[PDB]
C-alpha cells in the first residue's frame, strides 16, 4: 500500500483482512495490533474494526519521501484463546507525491 506526502492525520490509507484458511465456517475472530517493536511512536494507527478487518490510519500530518520513503508495519493477528496464538504480516507503506490479506497460521 501507499500514503500521500500531503496526507493529514486520521486518514484511512488501507484496510487489512485477517484470513484463516483452516476456518471454513467463520468461527474465529482475530485481534489486530502492531508488533511490540512498532507498538509505540508509529506514524500510523491500527483501528481494529472487530470483524476480521482493521484500518491503517495516518498518525501524523505530512510525510516526506526524502526523510523516509518506505514504512514496514509489522501487524499481529491474534486468536482469542488460552494460551493465545498469533501470526505476523509485514505491511509495506510507500510515501508518494499526490483488500490486503494477513494470514493466520
Amino acid at each position, epitope marked *: 500500500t501507499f500514503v500521500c506526502e500531503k496526507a493529514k492525520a486520521d486518514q484511512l490509507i488501507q484496510t487489512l483482512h485477517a484470513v484463516d484458511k483452516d476456518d471454513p465456517y467463520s468461527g474465529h475472530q482475530f485481534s489486530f495490533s502492531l508488533a511490540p517493536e512498532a507498538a509505540s511512536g508509529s506514524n500510523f494507527t491500527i483501528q*481494529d474494526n472487530k470483524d476480521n478487518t482493521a484500518g491503517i490510519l495516518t498518525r501524523k500530518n505530512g510525510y516526506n519521501r526524502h526523510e523516509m520513503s518506505t514504512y514496514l508495519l509489522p501487524v499481529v493477528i491474534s486468536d*482469542n484463546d488460552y494460551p493465545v496464538q498469533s501470526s505476523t504480516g509485514t505491511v509495506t507503506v510507500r510515501v508518494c507525491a499526490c483488500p490486503l490479506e494477513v494470514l493466520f497460521q
Partner: antibody
Amino acid sequence: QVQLLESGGGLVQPGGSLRLSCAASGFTFSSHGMHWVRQAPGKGLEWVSVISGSGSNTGYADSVKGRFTISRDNSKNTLYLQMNSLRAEDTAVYYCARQWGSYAFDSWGQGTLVTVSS
Amino acid sequence: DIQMTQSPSSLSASVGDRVTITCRASQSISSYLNWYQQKPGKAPKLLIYAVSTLQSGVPSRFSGSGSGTDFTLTISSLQPEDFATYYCQQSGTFPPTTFGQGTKVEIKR
C-alpha cells in the same frame, strides 16, 4: 450482537459457597478464552480466573486458588464460577468477560454483586 | 505480581483540553498494555489494545503510547461524554493480568 448475561450473585455467609453463571450469545462461544474479573465496592479491577475455549485449560489468581473453580458448558454457551470458602474480602461485583487477543477484555457482563456476610 | 500505578488518581478538565493519563509498571513490560473506560454503574469498555490499537467505535481523540515501564492514554479534545474512570492493564506475562488503580475523569463546567 455479542451478549454476556450474568446471574447467581447475592448474600452468602463466611465459609459459604455460591455459583455464578454467564450466558453468552452473538458469537462463537467455544472460540474464546472466558474470564472472571471482580471489583470490590468503590475499588479497582481484580482478575480472578481464565478458561480456554475447549474448557480444558484453566487459571486462577493467587487470591482465589484452591477455593474457586471455573468451568464452562459449551453446549449451553454458559460460563460458571464455583466459589467456596468465601471470605469477607471476596465481596465484589463479579464480571464475566470475553478474551480479546492477549488477555484484553472486549465484552463484559452487567455484573453481579456477591456479599459475604454473617 | 507486576503492580500498575496510574497518575493522577483523579482529574478535572475542560471540554477541548488535551488530557493525559499516565500508567507506570513495577517492572518493564512489553507491549501488552490495554486501556479501559468505565462509566458509573457500567462494565469497563476496551478503548486501546496493545499500547496503541484503537478499537471499533472509539473516537480517534483516544490514543495510546509508551514503552518499558511508562504508558500514556491521551484524550486530545476532551468531551462531556468522556466522564468515567480509566484503567490500564498489563497482559503480557499471563497469568495473572493486573490493572492500574483507576483515574476518575471529571468534566469542568
